[PDB]
Amino acid sequence: NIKVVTDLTGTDVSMKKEINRIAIVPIPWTSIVYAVDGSDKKIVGIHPSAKKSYEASIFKTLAPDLENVNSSFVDNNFNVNFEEVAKLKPDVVIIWDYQPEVAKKLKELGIPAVSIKYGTLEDIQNGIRLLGKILDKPEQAEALISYHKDSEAYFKQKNASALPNKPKVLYLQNKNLTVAGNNSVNQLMITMTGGENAAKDTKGSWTKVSMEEIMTWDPDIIILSNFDSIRPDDIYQDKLEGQNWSNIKAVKTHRVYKAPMGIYRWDAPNVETPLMMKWMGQLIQPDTFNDYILRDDLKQFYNTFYHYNLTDSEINTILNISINNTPTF
Secondary structure, eight states: OEEEEEOTTSOEEEEESSOOOEEEOSSTHHHHHHHHHTSSTTEEEOOHHHHHHHHHSTHHHHOGGGGGSBOOSBOTTOOBOHHHHHHHOOSEEEEETTOHHHHHHHHHTTOOEEEEOOSSHHHHHHHHHHHHHHHTOHHHHHHHHHHHHHHHHHHHHHOGGGOSSOOEEEEEOSSSSEEEOTTSHHHHHHHHTTOEETTTTOOSSEEEOOHHHHHHHOOSEEEEOSSSOOOHHHHHTTOSTTOOOTTSHHHHTTOEEEOOBSSSBSSSSOTTHHHHHHHHHHHHOTTTSOSOOHHHHHHHHIIIIIOOOOOHHHHHHHHTHHHHTOTTO
16 A cells, blocks of 8 residues: 655655645646656646646646646645644655755655755656656656656757857747856757857856846847747837847847747756757757758647647647747747
């Protein structure tokens, strides 16, 4: 009746052999549990921000039943309501490595908890492997990990970061001049796909800068994040107070693009990150990344892992094809 799983902190956690009810504290991990199980059927608690994101994405179509899941058991500062979780009776709760006191209290309440980590693409893969053991879906978990590893190997072999004369790329978060800095995964993704980071010398993950700095950088390509409603026509038509984008190369050449969003936003590490890398590659170095069709790979991924066959309309929405005027996707 019992099994023991080792979590990402090296803690051995006892739980039922058959896990039927899972609660998830980390925001992106609701979509990741869904991906590993190929189903939302075992999910009984999610972060309220995970619910918010769910309502805004294709996730809502894939997993209509999550509409009625509990999202009250944890707040925005990741504080757990232990009374609520005890009522919910999950078989396991996914928590963060920095919450050992939560693990201990949950254990005292008879509720197993597994700790995961954040920051890297390896953390995603190790977390998936752990979920495979929890959910008894090791084949799907390893298929997802292999997919990520094969994608990583493909981009390492292409070695686009070694190319000369790379386009300068700015990852703009919002309407308030906040950009991806040199501690962000976004700058790593820009480098791996053969771009130069416009904000290379700006520290932090997301950092506010001046319009004057951006004018000086003069990026060739601008990617807009999904943290904010900002869209390309907001830049093209200078709708943003105190900002003049009109003389920037990316703006004059109409190379301002809204980042895609699948099951979760693609702006940080997630289960669909290899698809994001493929999108960026074809924007930044299309002559290098010319041996795949992103639309086909997206359809294949959704069919294989989610048993869902995307329509052309759904693909347009995910990849912002109309919004970005990128009809070749």
